[PDB]
Amino acid sequence: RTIVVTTILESPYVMYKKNHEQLEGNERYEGYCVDLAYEIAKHVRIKYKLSIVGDGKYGARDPETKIWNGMVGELVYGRADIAVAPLTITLVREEVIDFSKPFMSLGISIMIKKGTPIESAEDLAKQTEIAYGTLDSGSTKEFFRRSKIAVYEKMWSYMKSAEPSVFTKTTADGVARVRKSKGKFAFLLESTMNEYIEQRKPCDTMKVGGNLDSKGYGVATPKGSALGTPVNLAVLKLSEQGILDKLKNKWWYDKGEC
Amino acid sequence: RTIVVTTILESPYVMYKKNHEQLEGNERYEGYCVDLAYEIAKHVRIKYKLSIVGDGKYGARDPETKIWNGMVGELVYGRADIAVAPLTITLVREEVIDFSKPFMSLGISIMIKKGTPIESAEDLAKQTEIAYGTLDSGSTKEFFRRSKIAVYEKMWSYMKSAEPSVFTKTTADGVARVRKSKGKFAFLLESTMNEYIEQRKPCDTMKVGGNLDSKGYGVATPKGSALGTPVNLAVLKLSEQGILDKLKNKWWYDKGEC
Numbered sequence: 061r062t063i064v065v066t067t068i069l070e071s072p073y074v075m076y077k078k079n080h081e082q083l084e085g086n087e088r089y090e091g092y093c094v095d096l097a098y099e100i101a102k103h104v105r106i107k108y109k110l111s112i113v114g115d116g117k118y119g120a121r122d123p124e125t126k127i128w129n130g131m132v133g134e135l136v137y138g139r140a141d142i143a144v145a146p147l148t149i150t151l152v153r154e155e156v157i158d159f160s161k162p163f164m165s166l167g168i169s170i171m172i173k174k175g176t177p178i179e180s181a182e183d184l185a186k187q188t189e190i191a192y193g194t195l196d197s198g199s200t201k202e203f204f205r206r207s208k209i210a211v212y213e214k215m216w217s218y219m220k221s222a223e224p225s226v227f228t229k230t231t232a233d234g235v236a237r238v239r240k241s242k243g244k245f246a247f248l249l250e251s252t253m254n255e256y257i258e259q260r261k262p263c264d265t266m267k268v269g270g271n272l273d274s275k276g277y278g279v280a281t282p283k284g285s286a287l288g289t290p291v292n293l294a295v296l297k298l299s300e301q302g303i304l305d306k307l308k309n310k311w312w313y314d315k316g317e318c
Numbered sequence: 319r320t321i322v323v324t325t326i327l328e329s330p331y332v333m334y335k336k337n338h339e340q341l342e343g344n345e346r347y348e349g350y351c352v353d354l355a356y357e358i359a360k361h362v363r364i365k366y367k368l369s370i371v372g373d374g375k376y377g378a379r380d381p382e383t384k385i386w387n388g389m390v391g392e393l394v395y396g397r398a399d400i401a402v403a404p405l406t407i408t409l410v411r412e413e414v415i416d417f418s419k420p421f422m423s424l425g426i427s428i429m430i431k432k433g434t435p436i437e438s439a440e441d442l443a444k445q446t447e448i449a450y451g452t453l454d455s456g457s458t459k460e461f462f463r464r465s466k467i468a469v470y471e472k473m474w475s476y477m478k479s480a481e482p483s484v485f486t487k488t489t490a491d492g493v494a495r496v497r498k499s500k501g502k503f504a505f506l507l508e509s510t511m512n513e514y515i516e517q518r519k520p521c522d523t524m525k526v527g528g529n530l531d532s533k534g535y536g537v538a539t540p541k542g543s544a545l546g547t548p549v550n551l552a553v554l555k556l557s558e559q560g561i562l563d564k565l566k567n568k569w570w571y572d573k574g575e576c
């Protein structure tokens with residue numbers, strides 16, 4: 061009767077509460093996806109337990125073993141019933157799991173330390189002084205690997221061979237590298253994460269240029285799961301009631317520091 | 319073997335070609351949804367015929383007879399196999415038809431004649447000199463009818479009782495009323511239509527303020543249709559290949575006149 065909700069520690073979607081080490085179960089966490097899971101479970105009338113994905117990854121398929129990792133693998137292998145996380149709806153994932161209609165819009169974007177002389181992907185592509193990278197095992201890395209657009213093909217050729225590695229294990233590690241690199245590293249990440257970090261102390265980063273694509277996050281369920289339909293209607297209802305909007309303002313802008 | 323694709327004459331999604339009266343069948347039409355239908359049919363490997371919906375409506379359910387009109391009714395009553403049109407994904411529609419993941423993002427927006435002293439919905443709500451309305455039988459009208467947000471509730475109370483009527487039979491009729499009214503009528507319509515008109519001669523309108531909501535258009539199929547799955551993957555593929563982007567630029571901005 062208690063369903064397992066896989067999710068990932070990524071600010072401001074799921075974060076440890078201030079005193080989390082004194083708390084237990086769902087009470088350990090807060091953020092946009094913690095609130096979304098609560099609202100969804102309320103409408104679908106299920107009890108649930110949040111479970112941070114062990115490997116800390118969104119989900120990709122190993123080309124060798126063909127095994128899915130991350131939250132996607134938790135659904136595929138039957139270890140979680142739903143994922144409520146900033147999980148990008150992509151074709152390769154839709155082949156193996158189901159997604160709700162999207163609860164948030166986003167695009168890939170460029171994060172720079174303020175003052176870096178870069179305004180566009182073209183600007184990064186044509187130079188070599190400023191290194192740049194992306195998160196491992198997620199949809200941004202796959203966007204670059206799969207693109208047939210000249211500028212992004214050039215960026216992928218550079219990142220794939222860069223030494224030392226430009227692929228980070230977590231978003232926070234990429235942000236930290238931008239902040240510590242005196243303008244010499246830029247990070248490619250989703251506009252939602254980029255806009256959140258831009259509003260947080262020390263206010264030394266910014267999003268530059270427009271987004272490189274336009275896509276959405278959805279709530280995911282194992283393929284053919286009976287929960288898929290009610291979850292989808294719940295997301296649509298929350299959207300129409302203005303709740304998704306209220307949550308975005310709560311977690312991004314209400315508390316902005318910059 | 320030839321499937322019926324319902325659609326609607328709405329610029330720049332489907333428009334008559336210059337010499338349409340000398341042409342037949344699918345060749346009569348051009349625009350973003352004509353291109354999208356072609357790309358989808360190519361991936362799903364179907365032959366198809368475009369059919370402009372007879373009543374010229376998107377789709378709503380009559381509260382009395384309970385009958386669906388517009389493109390939604392064509393799918394519900396079995397007269398069309400797919401709708402490829404700027405058809406908004408909504409909860410009440412998802413209860414009776416299926417939708418692909420969204421091919422375009424949009425929100426409700428305000429269209430004014432340039433120079434009108436209005437910058438926000440709040441600005442319209444608190445005054446009465448400038449009338450304002452929306453399209454009949456679509457999702458924008460339903461947004462206002464259903465909102466529990468104070469400002470939009472006030473706008474709905476005004477529009478519902480306005481005399482003469484502020485609800486238009488087509489988008490073009492609303493645009494024409496804005497243009498002819500010397501600043502005394504504003505039109506509530508989707509950001510996509512608003513941004514297209516803003517780029518067309520006589521360049522006398524503009525979008526003002528941010529969008530009131532955030533939602534998407536999807537390709538629709540009758541509930542439980544076998545075409546639903548392949549169409550959805552086709553839309554995701556076109557999105558990832560940058561084709562939806564290319565089409566948006568082709569139909570909105572490439573030809574901009576303002």
Ligand SMILES: COc1ccc(C(=O)N2CCCC2=O)cc1
Pocket residue numbers: 149162163164165166274275276277419420421422423424532533534557562
């Ligand atoms: C919050 O509303 C939305 C979030 C995401 C999406 C989406 O998935 N897509 C696909 C193509 C372009 C785009 O934005 C559409 C609407």
Ligand SMILES: N[C@@H](CCC(=O)O)C(=O)O
Pocket residue numbers: 118119146147148195197198199200201248249250
């Ligand atoms: N949302 C992405 C993770 C972040 C990224 O790849 O930039 C995914 O679902 O894979």
Ligand SMILES: N[C@@H](CCC(=O)O)C(=O)O
Pocket residue numbers: 376377404405406453455456457458459506507508
């Ligand atoms: N896209 C809308 C029509 C336009 C509007 O209502 O503003 C619909 O699907 O109903």
Ligand SMILES: [Zn+2]
Pocket residue numbers: 076080
């Ligand atoms: Zn701690």
Ligand SMILES: [Zn+2]
Pocket residue numbers: 099102103
């Ligand atoms: Zn609720």
Ligand SMILES: [Zn+2]
Pocket residue numbers: 334338
């Ligand atoms: Zn004509």
Ligand SMILES: [Zn+2]
Pocket residue numbers: 357360361
């Ligand atoms: Zn194609």
